[PDB]
């Protein structure tokens, strides 16, 4: 069983970072911002095994009709913000949209993912998330890509809602 | 000539306020932000008659699939930030991306409005407003939805971005 997910969020969430912690075990620092690529991972996740197809999305502000319809492929979507930068959370609800956009509106699997945990220079409540993703009626999981805090299990979650949806 | 005329731009920004100046000749100090409806006018602009249908948009921030098929029938779009109010400058790039997606097209009539310039606490520089009209090969034009100022160019110049894109 193979899934595709797709990590997405503002520039400089820690998109990258996260999905090569997750992948390689170790953080890099200031991954060039212009590398999309697709990263393979066989998982074992409450006893059961899948194959993650992990999409860690860059490039420009602008939508398409390919965009639109390699975006509809995924299965499942990482949103992330940083806690320390108010835009990117404040985004989220705009990646939301546009992802129920292609997707025919259906109730696609999601997971909040807060990220850069680490930090003291908070600017986004924890309960501010809590609540976006009750709305949403979705998981949070707060993360750090730099500590490993949270990391695998923001992917896992993903995959335990996908597997809900299916 | 009918023209649909669709007005853009960030909460607050001035767009009922703008259409109501156009339409009916006095300033809103405050108008419902739930209310989106469509203005009707003649108008002569450059020696040639036109009809315009101006809706005045408003709701939330939200996408359905017949939202993309209202917005499909504009002709040309007023984007509207208010040159207080610096994040609403930066959602014109937004604005812009979801009618080029809309519309299939990077060549839609549009012109950018940086409205209240009748206040003097600005936030935008004009330049940088310049500067943006003129990577999207658009006109930019200042208002004061309270004054009048530039309000029926806003309107007008975008009927003539029309008219050249019919042609
Ligand atoms: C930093 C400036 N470079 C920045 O904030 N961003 C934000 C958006 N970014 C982004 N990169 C790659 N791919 C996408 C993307 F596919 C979409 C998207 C979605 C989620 C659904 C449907 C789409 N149709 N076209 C694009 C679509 C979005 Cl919203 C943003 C993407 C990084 C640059
Ligand atoms: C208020 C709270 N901060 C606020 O900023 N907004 C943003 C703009 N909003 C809005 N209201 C009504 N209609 C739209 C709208 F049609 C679109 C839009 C555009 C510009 C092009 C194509 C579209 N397809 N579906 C919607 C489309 C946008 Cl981007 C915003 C709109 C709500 C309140
Ligand atoms: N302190 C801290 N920095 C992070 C974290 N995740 C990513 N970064 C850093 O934030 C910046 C942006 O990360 P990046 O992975 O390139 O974000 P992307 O643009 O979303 O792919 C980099 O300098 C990263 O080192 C984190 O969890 N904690
Ligand atoms: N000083 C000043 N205030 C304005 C102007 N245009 C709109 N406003 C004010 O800004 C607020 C929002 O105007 P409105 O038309 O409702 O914005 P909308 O949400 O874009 O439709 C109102 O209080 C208006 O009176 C302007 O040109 N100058
Ligand atoms: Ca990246
Ligand atoms: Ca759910
Ligand atoms: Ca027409
Ligand atoms: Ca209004
Ligand atoms: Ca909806
Ligand atoms: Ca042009």
Same mark, same amino acid.
């Given at each position: 069983?193979?899934?595709?997910?797709?990590?997405?969020?503002?520039?400089?969430?820690?998109?990258? #970072?996260?999905?090569?912690?997750?992948?390689?075990?170790?953080?890099?620092?200031?991954?060039?911002?212009?590398?999309?690529?697709?990263?393979?991972?066989?998982?074992?996740?409450?006893? /059961?095994?899948?194959?993650?197809?992990? !999409?860690?999305?860059?490039?420009?502000? /602008?939508?398409? #009709?390919?965009?639109?319809?390699?975006?509809?492929?995924? /299965?499942?979507?990482?949103?992330?913000?940083?806690?320390?930068?108010?835009?990117?959370?404040?985004?989220?609800?705009?990646?939301?949209?546009?992802?129920?956009?292609?997707?025919?509106?259906?109730?696609?699997?999601?997971? !909040?993912?807060?990220?850069?945990?680490? !930090?003291?220079?908070?600017?986004?409540?924890?309960?501010? #998330?809590?609540? !976006?993703?009750?709305?949403?009626?979705?998981?949070?999981?707060?993360?750090?890509?730099?500590?490993?805090?949270?990391?695998?299990?923001?992917?896992?979650?993903?995959?335990?809602?996908?597997?809900?949806?299916?």
């Amino acid at each position: 069983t193979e899934y595709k997910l797709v990590v997405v969020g503002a520039c400089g969430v820690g998109k990258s #970072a996260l999905t090569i912690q997750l992948i390689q075990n170790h953080f890099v620092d200031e991954y060039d911002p212009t590398i999309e690529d697709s990263y393979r991972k066989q998982v074992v996740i409450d006893g /059961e095994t899948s194959l993650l197809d992990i !999409l860690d999305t860059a490039g420009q502000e /602008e939508y398409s #009709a390919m965009r639109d319809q390699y975006m509809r492929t995924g /299965e499942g979507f990482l949103l992330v913000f940083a806690i320390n930068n108010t835009k990117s959370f404040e985004d989220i609800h705009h990646y939301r949209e546009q992802i129920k956009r292609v997707k025919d509106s259906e109730d696609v699997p999601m997971v !909040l993912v807060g990220n850069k945990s680490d !930090l003291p220079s908070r600017t986004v409540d924890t309960k501010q #998330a809590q609540d !976006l993703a009750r709305s949403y009626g979705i998981p949070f999981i707060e993360t750090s890509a730099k500590t490993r805090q949270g990391v695998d299990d923001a992917f896992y979650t993903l995959v335990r809602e996908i597997r809900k949806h299916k």
